[PDB]
RNA sequence: AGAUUCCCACUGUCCCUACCUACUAUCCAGCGAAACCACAGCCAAGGGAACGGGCUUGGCGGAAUCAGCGGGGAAAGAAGA
Ligand SMILES: [Mg+2]
Ligand SMILES: [Mg+2]
């Protein structure tokens with residue numbers, strides 16, 4: 094007969110292959126649309142999650158109760174060291190899709206990138222791809238280079254560029270680096286290629302890619318949680334107490350006459366470690382690293398206009414499971430995808446953002462230092478000393 | 488030893504009624520440009536005739552369901568697979584002789600293509616009726632590649648205008664040396680007229 | 687006695703055979719298929735690294751419910767296990783065969799095993815006790831073994 | 840230790856689900872069974888002893904396997920009480 098009482102469906106069929114993702118690093122599927130109007134510029138960027146903290150700002154929106162009141166918000170911290178360009182790669186336009194055409198590397202590839210291509214760096218004799226780097230010092234090579242580049246002048250339509258991250262500047266355990274392709278949008282191919290030819294074997298920081306409080310998208314891989322059931326997975330109800338063969342189940346699987354089982358019934362498997370793509374996270378602040386000038390180091394990162402203390406964005410006793418921050422950082426809004434020490438892929442916005450809340454300009458007032466590692470009750474070191482006093486340990 | 492075919496102006500059932508016999512009789516056929524084919528009947532009836540085929544998916548796991556191809560090639564290959572015994576080793580060893588392309592690839596542009604007259608819209612339709620294209624149909628039903636095909640079918644028409652100009656340029660030179668010489672080939676034509684070659 | 691497969695030249699071949707051994711039959715079949723073409727100083731190193739869980743023995747046929755291992759990715763197969771008795775009771779056989787390959791007066795350390803064969807055996811009988819006063823049998827499964835070495839340089 | 844209804848105190852029965860622990864299951868060394876089985880195992884419609892795992896017309900199909908799972912096999916039990 095019919096179901097007596099109506100109900101909405103549990104879960105979504107849009108994400109149904111809930112499997113362990115075949116890639117750990119995030120993968121950009123959809124780059125933004127170019128036009129020959131604007132000058133050339135990159136689109137995506139690659140960073141590393143560290144932790145979370147408060148913020149306290151003022152709100153400027155007319156037509157609400159919160160106008161001109163000091164609200165608080167919750168942010169993340171994403172450490173973004175400068176990236177290195179190690180090669181270009183073109184693409185052609187076909188009716189069967191979009192075939193790749195030609196790839197041209199640089200002369201002195203660092204050993205951080207010589208790693209990724211290997212598995213067992215200790216046992217290998219480190220023949221680190223040194224016939225191709227005979228093609229940047231001999232005059233039999235710069236012909237085929239000038240004809241490769243004139244081929245990508247003529248026959249190429251989209252030019253992505255090969256960049257790898259920089260691992261010497263991180264407190265992580267590993268020593269291997271992440272390569273990635275990033276698409277350059279701009280004018281014609283002649284301009285785009287003469288721009289990127291110059292940047293070859295260089296550092297590219299964040300601020301020559303982004304700006305401030307532009308709405309961006311975050312592509313990353315979920316925290317993983319093992320082989321969970323169907324209550325923890327699809328979030329259904331539990332059966333009552335008087336049952337016999339368990340109670341965290343789903344009772345009626347399918348109907349009779351469809352002799353199969355439908356593919357939309359909630360079954361038990363893997364949970365987490367998936368690919369996901371969040372949209373419209375807004376940036377509040379782009380800090381700067383520990384730079385040493387005139388002997389000592391200057392670390393007034395978190396010095397706002399109103400606190401104007403010299404404290405940085407490292408809390409007391411370091412971030413948990415990450416370490417300390419010496420490089421720069423972006424400061425997002427809301428939670429993001431991925432556990433700690435997880436690599437994360439940023440991207441500018443697909444959408445023509447024109448509303449009243451994505452045009453709001455942002456002023457901070459007070460960045461917290463909450464040593465989660467225990468309840469916080471201080472902000473920095475010396476105030477804790479000028480408040481407790483002298484100790485027996487001294 | 489290998490046939491070629493155009494796809495403009497030919498019908499869909501009449502072409503596949505010639506081709507599913509000529510394949511089984513041992514003859515490699517390649518049919519190029521299968522987006523200029525047109526279908527009998529008006530447009531919106533063949534679109535509701537096709538979206539009532541797109542609504543038919545196997546219910547419990549559609550990945551096992553009817554693979555709805557959307558290209559005009561894998562539609563013409565669909566409506567040949569129906570005219571063949573595709574369960575047996577004399578069907579599966581015939582479909583690997585047929586080869587269908589969207590647009591026209593470079594291996595088959597510098598070759599003279601043959602044209603079937605028995606399947607043309609101007610012959611097999613009264614001229615007061617309606618016909619419907621297939622390309623604009625596939626674009627309306629989910630084909631993403633007309634903005635590439637239209638310009639790759641523009642760069643070869645521009646290459647063949649040039650090849651027709653240098654075909655005319657050698658032909659005029661041929662008819663002027665054939666005007667200068669015929670003093671000395673006056674005798675090698677009074678032997679051809681009486682055998683019927685230059686009338 | 688008369689073995690199944692006749693050797694090529696009994697000058698170069700040493701023989702051995704064990705009757706009515708108490709092991710399983712299937713474990714011993716498979717670990718007596720991984721060994722067929724090796725050298726004797728490799729086989730006596732393998733059958734120890736089977737004991738100490740270094741190299742594994744892949745179950746190809748009798749694989750019901752047998753879990754997988756990573757070390758069997760050498761043999762290009764997923765399901766392996768590390769059986770102990772079936773590697774002891776045909777190592778004490780390669781000491782019998784080596785001593786008779788010395789008594790006949792051949793060269794020991796160039797023997798290539800060419801033939802090994804395991805048969806079924808007469809089943810023993812015990813009994814066990816189930817519900818409602820029923821009795822189910824609890825039989826074993828021993829095996830026969832015979833093998834032919836050969837010097838192949 | 841009988842059957843019905845109402846109010847006080849108390850409560851994870853419930854809104855609405857979470858977390859910890861023990862022995863199990865899971866993988867390994869050892870020992871090691873039975874119930875059952877014509878041949879075997881992907882689906883829609885049609886006819887048909889009027890609801891097929893096989894025939895017909897179509898859709899389609901790629902070894903060998905592990906942990907789960909209860910829709911089906913008009914499942915197993917017992918010559919319908
Ligand atoms: Mg409903
Ligand atoms: Mg009960």
Ligand SMILES: [Mg+2]
Pocket residue numbers: 464465466467468
């Ligand atoms: Mg804490």
Ligand SMILES: [Mg+2]
Pocket residue numbers: 412413464465466467
């Ligand atoms: Mg902590």
Ligand SMILES: [Mg+2]
Pocket residue numbers: 746747748749
């Ligand atoms: Mg088997």
Ligand SMILES: [Mg+2]
Pocket residue numbers: 815816817
């Ligand atoms: Mg018992």
Ligand SMILES: [Mg+2]
Pocket residue numbers: 818819
């Ligand atoms: Mg008893």
Ligand SMILES: [Mg+2]
Pocket residue numbers: none
């Ligand atoms: Mg065991």
Ligand SMILES: [Mg+2]
Pocket residue numbers: 887
């Ligand atoms: Mg019937």
Ligand SMILES: [Mg+2]
Pocket residue numbers: 892
């Ligand atoms: Mg049946």
Ligand SMILES: [Mg+2]
Pocket residue numbers: none
């Ligand atoms: Mg049959």
Ligand SMILES: [Mg+2]
Pocket residue numbers: 909911
């Ligand atoms: Mg069932």
Ligand SMILES: [Mg+2]
Pocket residue numbers: none
């Ligand atoms: Mg039943």
Ligand SMILES: [Mg+2]
Pocket residue numbers: 918
């Ligand atoms: Mg009866």
Ligand SMILES: [Mg+2]
Pocket residue numbers: 918
């Ligand atoms: Mg009776």
